[PDB]
């Protein structure tokens, strides 16, 4: 029951959390987090992604804006905290998309890496499907 009160560090500068543990202000302070990515307090850098359902392509469409806000934070050498309401579905899908790009992982390998750091992962299948669409998009953009 205590783990729910803290975000999880995924790789350096990248933290995965919920509306709940976003309130862990000391965690934020001690990990130098200055950005928050809301998937779904006016003292931080904030970006909201407007994802309201698992159908269609709202998650896919929001991928390049998310990666950008995230890399902007890595560039400052500061933490970004990525959160959805329960922290279990939408926020982890975004973190997966990011690592696919940033560490050239396939969908499944980026999934497994996050899963092994964050056992509560439970992403709706429409989101998994959109992540696979992103996988294909990256393949084409990245061909010799």
**Any long-range contacts for 108-115 (C-beta under 8 Å, 24+ apart)?**
114/10, 114/16
Judge contact between 62 and 50, C-beta under 8 A. yes
Enter the tokens of residue 51. 């994802």
Query: Which CATH number do you get for residue 80?
Result: 3.90.190.10
CA geometry: angle at 78 spanning 123 and 120, to 5°? 20
Query: CA–CA separation, 50 vs 85, rounded Å?
Result: 13
Q: Give the domain extent around 125.
A: 1-144
Pairing verdict, β 33-39 and 45-49? parallel
Query: At what resolution in Å was this solved?
Result: 2.3
Query: CA–CA separation, 49 vs 41, rounded Å?
Result: 16
Judge contact between 13 and 74, C-beta under 8 A. yes
Burial class (CB in 10 A: 0-12, 13-18, 19+), 4: exposed
Q: Method of determination? A: X-ray
Count of structural domains, the chain: 1
């Amino acid at each position: 029951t205590f783990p729910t009160l803290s975000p999880t560090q995924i790789i350096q500068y990248i933290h995965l959390g919920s509306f709940l543990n976003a309130h862990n202000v000391d965690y934020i302070h001690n990990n130098n987090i200055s950005s928050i990515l809301l998937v779904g307090k006016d003292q931080c850098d904030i970006l909201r992604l407007d994802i309201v359902s698992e159908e269609g392509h709202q998650l896919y469409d929001s991928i390049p804006n998310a990666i950008k806000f995230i890399i902007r934070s890595i560039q400052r050498k500061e933490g970004v905290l990525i959160i959805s309401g329960t922290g279990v579905n939408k926020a982890p899908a975004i973190v997966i998309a990011f690592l696919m790009y940033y560490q050239r992982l396939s969908f499944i390998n980026a999934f497994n890496k996050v899963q092994g750091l964050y056992p509560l992962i439970d992403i709706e299948s429409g989101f998994i499907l959109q992540l696979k669409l992103f996988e294909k998009k990256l393949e084409k953009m990245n061909s010799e």
